[PDB]
Symmetry: D2
Subunit: 445 residues, 4 copies
């Protein structure tokens, strides 16, 4: 007897989308097909798309220490409402930063009973743990995040990057990198402030494309020489993507990601919205956006992730140059991209499924996640196409109910989210069950 | 309920191989998973690999005119015994060559009741049909084959202008062009030269078709196809240098795919010398270092499909020395088991990569919506492969019309135990061929 | 003491153009500098540019057999009046074609005393002499010219014939072994021929129709094919008259990868475009076609970027009867030998600001260096005293009567040209003077590779 | 009448080497050819190669302030003895460093009467003068040197990525090239410390602590930042064919970049370095013979624009200690021409006119020295006479440096400098030493 059968949905499979039923047993996808028979429970997905749960490879929760920025409780409720069933949690903003076993075990205690979704873990590669990267590897982190160019996050200089990447290469861990030449970016920003240039266009001119390209080029070469697998975080320009593409076409093991706000917003809209649209690699002009869409449709951008980066509203007050950078968008990755990629620009459903879930799970070794296939976790989002709503602040489950998407007309709706076989979010019910999420550790799956 | 359930096999799915049951209804995959329930018939696939049936994108049958070379009866039985469930049939050797509605309708009639497997069809782009390419597009070929620079109904090569113009037309119709890429002039003149010198060993024959003759032809057709706006498929690539040309072009955005054949991964010029004219084929079997590079390209994902280029001929055309003998490998029956042994068992290729190379990639390139993958709603086309189970291939084993092959005498480390086409066992290692031939032609606009 | 001193000119040296005097003795440059002393004769070059005389690496004279198209007598007079002092003569359209020792010796005999300029020689690599290429290498040709047709076109016995891919590869291999460069007319002839037939069939016979029937990709395909075959055969390659920047880009990429390849173009691809072709008629029809203005702008950037090694005439005259008919029926070829130096000086240097030493390399030094003409192409001590004096900012309207070709037609007639050839000096003697005409008997000689 | 005629030498002209005479008047080349006539003085170059004087684009003299490392007096005598007639002086080691008008004018005062050769000038692009680059441009430096990455005030200091980008952007505006020492200094330092920690301090350990990839990374970074800034770039002393290849790739894409190397990277290898000790230690390190084979191929392929000394002397006390502790730098100013003539022309078959370009003409053209680098009418009469197939063993006593040490001491060198001529006067002669008071002059960009 199956625990559950989802019937009549347009199911996103590896190869195509088609109307098929999904049988579920013990939290796992037990069968896919027709005439699957009887089950304790039956769901009608007629007229909906059944996607694999989003796998968000770039999520800041920052609980231990900076929990008042978001925290697990609100952060993962918003994730589930946004159709995210697995997040890959960054090591930073949390204090202590997640850099060794004690720091990650501290966070593990902090999270007990608060996980509404499943969560794999990224370790930090920082200046003060190059000697102890094996610790988080043993615990089962799925990658290490660093920034280049006392329990808080710190960047690494060129030598600390090369040495840490060398070690990570030996351990089988990928390095993830925020690629901006921050020295040049800081100094251009100071220059703009001195001159009283603090518009959105001024801020973007202060983080020009070449500062992304230089940093991607440096990181690519050092990671190659170190023998380390590489993932380039939130690429903001098609020029940055081309660097990654050129490297892979020469045989380098490198992947990259972007975020919905580089496909759906632009500098002119960033000006109108204000500091809620400020983020570190900046939202560039519309011609840049067009390039990014072409890269995405060309297959050069492996994953779409949130870079959910909230902060208390006092840090968003004031002019754009002094404000804290970060987009609160975790809840609107799936519906906004389905509307903008699938409905408006004609992207195929299985390509959507790859960009929002499968690729990330394959890159980070999440064996049970990312695909509607026999034996994987029964993690789904039901999406209602051609069903619009205007997003408002009290739709948001964030701790701080703000987002540069508030007031946007969004052409599709998350109607339901299912994690390992149980409905964790329902547009008609809210959150019907106690937090059932679990951490995912590499050697424990 | 379900007509059939295949249980306990290691199934090659798109993403991974795993032990799951397959339910079948009406020639179609009805479900995949566990506890699928009741069925009229149940197969036990324990200890076997259940692969999508091979989609062989490059098969010569040659039935009207040159049926005595192979023909539909023997050729498709060999294919089903080799674990191939869909062939994509070349338009040459048959007479009339398959170049317009009349010639293909002729063939259709000749083949009635003889198809043991399913067959998509290739048109020929030749010198005398440039203006009627739309005819075979209407019938529903999935591509057009040509050879780039006799009998009025035979196959003919096209010069550079006929290629460009034909490809320009095909690009408008949404049809790929498939090309045998060698500079035939240089290969012919080097061959005569070797003949005149009395240099007629296998090594001489390969030296008379050097790598640069394949690279030049590939570079020429890549550029002409690009300027013509036509999707291109480069047939049987024999060198990694040829593969590199295709890779470089795709990396620049050109819509091009390529294929190779088991004899370029499993045989080399030294074994070719030992075997003789049965190992002679047109793009030649090259040396062992070439082979090693070939394996590296395959494991790197630069070769889209593995195909047979099954090319038998009456034995008298294999008599004589290597330079004068007819070129062609009779290998239709041993693509799947040889390749499973050499790629999966001996070199560690993953089951999903093997499934993509032998079936899924070819199905996706030629638009065979129902074939090539174990997925819900696709045709229930499978091969059961028994790993780590060896046999010595003999002529008696061969279902070809001419029971010869350069693989005879080889120890092959895996066995094809069963072949299922649209839900029915068409070949079984123990029962032989249990059902009347049930194969159908596959036409592009009718699925 | 010196035979001659040329004083006060702006002399084009390899590195720069400066006012220096030139001393000549025994037909050779004996010294360069100031206060050179006494000489049997003095010329004033004030206000003039003193350039190396042009080295035209692509001239059709066709004398033995098709002399009535041009021939040595008129052809080299026109060359001298155009400021050319060395030509590198093609093996066609002469009959017999220059393909072996017997054919070139017949030609040497016919040319005796008719050379107004010096002439290095190119052999033909043709379908029927691949086994005899050593003969012309021994004689001393400086290179071998061929047309590559995948099939091999129609032709006359003893005439220039195209080579198929095999013949090109085998010949190129032998040329690589002899140390001889292969020169190639790079156009896919079949595709151009068939598209031309298409146009005629459709009633489309304008100049724009002709250019569309020889599209850029037919040039690029042929260059790519020849680049690769010559590479494999191990042969130095020169790509003749490139008509498009896409063709230049193929040559550049090959060189950047280390291939030994050079290329050239012609003044008509820099100074005419298809719109002027349409107004001019068949006199501006040529095989690699004159393309549109956007193409011309790209050619100018290639040239200024150093990607085109040499400028040559491709002087391709024919009897005017062969210029009758519509553009698709007429014989291709530009009669332009007389107006390479002054048109290009005007268009490159005056109008577009090219440096005088770059002008000198493009018109003379690079060709001399590529084909190993040790005595030619540069104003340097010990080289031949070969010069042309050019008067800048001095214009004239070209008339038929100015032309010294056998057939006094050219697409440049009626053109306003902003500089003038005032004097041409060959091995220390005035052979052409704007005021005197041709003052001495023809003194030109053949230049042979091993007898320099 | 001419002041002088040099007769019967094999003269390296731009296009070829051939026997011709050179007439000189007023310190300039008046004529080249035969039968030039009478002169006040005649020299017999029979049997010698008459080359343009070397143009050394990378010289450290360090006079105002660190004169005791070398100084103009001994430095320029050694240059002249080695056949160098123009040096392009680096802004570093001297104190104050050459970074603005006051520091260079201070330098001009120290040099008076000490210049045996001519000296064009490089400025420093340093952390603290980015807003004042126009001053040295006005004075007439021919480029600006920097180190992209800690020092003395008024000393030479590194620039960070931002200072390099902003400075390069200004320099592109002024029409000045930027010259860069290209090593990832952080990674070299840290690997070097590692070596010491582990007790690994041989020459082979030092080279492995400055791996090729630290050169390639730094060149790639600078290539890309100079491009974005719009600045012409010169890459200093490349040590590896991998670094050259980065430069060649960028040029082939249209970037205006040039590079140089030094004799020690063609003529020494790490195994010799080990036997020599710290006198052969240099910042871009002398690599293994297989690397050296690659460098010779790059050189013969035209991928390296000039050869320069990177003369980097120091008091011998700084050469004490093991290889990891000693000060890096090669004292080799005196043995650039004769060693490269031997190794390149006599041993490896390089053409004389290519030698001329690599040792002189390219440097003069890159840095806009209109009067220098080539034997041609109207240029300065700067020559060196080289005697081929004439060998000698270098001794400490041969050296004119302040500190008479060099990693070439005791080496066999198969050609000899016999005469150096500067603007028409013999300033060095193997038969008479230095027969005229110092007559060198500074060369300023806007005053040639
Ligand atoms: Zn970030
Ligand atoms: Zn982030
Ligand atoms: Zn074939
Ligand atoms: Zn075939
Ligand atoms: Zn031509
Ligand atoms: Zn011609
Ligand atoms: Zn340095
Ligand atoms: Zn230095």
């Amino acid at each position: 007897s199956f625990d559950l059968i989802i019937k009549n949905g347009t199911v996103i499979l590896e190869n195509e989308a088609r109307v098929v039923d999904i049988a579920v047993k013990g939290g796992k996808i037990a069968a896919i097909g027709q005439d699957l028979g009887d089950a304790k429970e039956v769901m009608d997905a007629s007229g909906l798309v059944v996607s694999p749960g989003m796998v968000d490879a770039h999520t800041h929760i920052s609980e231990p220490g900076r929990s008042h920025w978001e925290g697990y409780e609100t952060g993962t409720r918003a994730a589930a409402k946004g159709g995210i069933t697995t997040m890959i949690e960054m090591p930073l903003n949390q204090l202590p930063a997640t850099v060794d076993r004690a720091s990650i075990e501290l966070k593990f205690d902090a999270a007990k009973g608060k996980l509404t979704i499943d969560a794999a873990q990224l370790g930090g590669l920082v200046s003060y743990n190059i000697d102890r990267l094996h610790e988080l590897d043993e615990v089962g982190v799925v990658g290490f995040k660093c920034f280049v160019a006392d329990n808080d996050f710190r960047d690494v200089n060129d030598w600390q990057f090369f040495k840490g990447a060398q070690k990570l290469g030996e351990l089988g861990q990928p390095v993830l990198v925020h690629c901006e030449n921050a020295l040049i970016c800081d100094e251009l920003g100071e220059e703009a402030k001195r001159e009283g240039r603090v518009t959105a266009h001024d801020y973007v001119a202060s983080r020009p494309v070449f500062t992304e390209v230089e940093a991607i080029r440096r990181v690519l070469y050092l990671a190659k020489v170190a023998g380390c697998r590489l993932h380039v975080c939130h690429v903001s320009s098609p020029e940055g993507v081309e660097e990654v593409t050129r490297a892979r076409q020469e045989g380098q093991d490198v992947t990259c990601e972007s975020c919905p706000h580089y496909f759906v917003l632009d500098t002119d809209q960033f000006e109108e919205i204000g500091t809620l649209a400020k983020c570190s690699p900046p939202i560039r002009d519309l011609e840049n956006q067009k390039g990014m869409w072409e890269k995405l449709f060309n297959g050069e951008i492996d994953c779409l992730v949130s870079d959910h980066s909230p902060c208390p509203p006092e840090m968003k007050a004031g002019n754009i140059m002094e404000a804290w950078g970060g987009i609160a968008g975790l809840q609107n990755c799936m519906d906004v991209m389905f509307d903008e990629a699938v409905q408006k620009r004609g992207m195929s459903l299985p390509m959507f499924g790859k960009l929002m879930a499968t690729n990330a799970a394959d890159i980070f070794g999440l064996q049970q996640k990312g695909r509607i296939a026999p034996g994987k976790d029964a993690d789904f989002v039901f999406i209602q196409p051609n069903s619009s709503y205007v997003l408002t602040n009290d739709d948001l489950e964030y701790r701080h109910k703000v987002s540069p998407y508030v007031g946007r007309t969004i052409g599709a709706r998350i109607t339901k989210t299912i994690l390992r076989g149980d409905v964790i979010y329902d547009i008609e019910q809210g959150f019907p069950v106690a937090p059932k999420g679990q951490f995912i550790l590499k050697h424990q799956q």
